[PDB]
Structure formats: C-alpha cells, structure tokens
Amino acid sequence: MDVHIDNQVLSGLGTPLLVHLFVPDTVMAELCPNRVPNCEGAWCQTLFSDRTGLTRVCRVFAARGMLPGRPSHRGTFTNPFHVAALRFYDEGGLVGELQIYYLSLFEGAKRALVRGIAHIFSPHALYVVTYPELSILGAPERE
C-alpha cells in the first residue's frame, strides 16, 4: 500500500493517472516457473492498439500481504481494448512479461476496498484496490 503514495509523491507527479492493481500468486504462476521471488524490479508499461504505439516504463514495488481482512486476498501486492505489460526479473535467470487489460479495470474500479476481475490473456482472477483519493478482436492479436 505504501507504494501508491510513494509513486504519488515521486512518479505520480511525473505521470498523470494511476490504477493501483494487486496480483495473486496464482496469477504469478503463469509467468514464473518453479519460483516465488519478490517482485521489486517489475516494470509496468502501456501498449495501445490500432491508433499509435508507445510504452512508459515504471516500477511499482510488490510485497506479499496479510493486510486483507478477507482470507481470499492473501498474497502479493503491486479507448479501453489495450494492453499493459509487466516485465519481471531478479538477480538470477528469470524474465517474465505479464499482460493486464482494460475493461477489467474500469468496471473493477466500482464501489479494504477490493474487487475481483478476470484476465483475458492468461485467465485467472485478480483483485483491484480503489483508494479514497481516487474494434475488439484485432487488438490482442498483433504481437
């Protein structure tokens, strides 16, 4: 949770808008094989189809969390139809790119404030936090 205000005092004053997203370890089981390392260096970027192409690269630190009072959210914390990609590394040999999409987020941001959403690229449930301060088919295919 501290990562959000860290960004809002250092990177949120460099980038306009932010959507704060929490990823379960089951969703992490998609990218990483046989490893559970902490996700500090994870680079989130945007990528939007059919108009123009651009990425903006940023780290939001991830830590495992017990803070949900709901037992189910026990785990790690870090024009709609387009992509975001998280590039995850450690000191060892492990590189993964995860794809978050929209219309899980804009619907998900509707009211521990939490809501469950679905992945399109690698289908699992993710959980979206909302802080009190707050052409379809061709779009994935191109890559």
């Binding site: 370890d25 992490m28 089981a29 046989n34 490893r35 559970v36």
Partner: peptide
C-alpha cells in the same frame, strides 16, 4: 508450505 515450486 515451504518449497521452491508453487505448483509442488
């Protein structure tokens, strides 16, 4: 719970 592999 302890393992390198979460799938294990």
């Amino acid at each position: 719970q302890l393992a390198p592999n979460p799938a294990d």
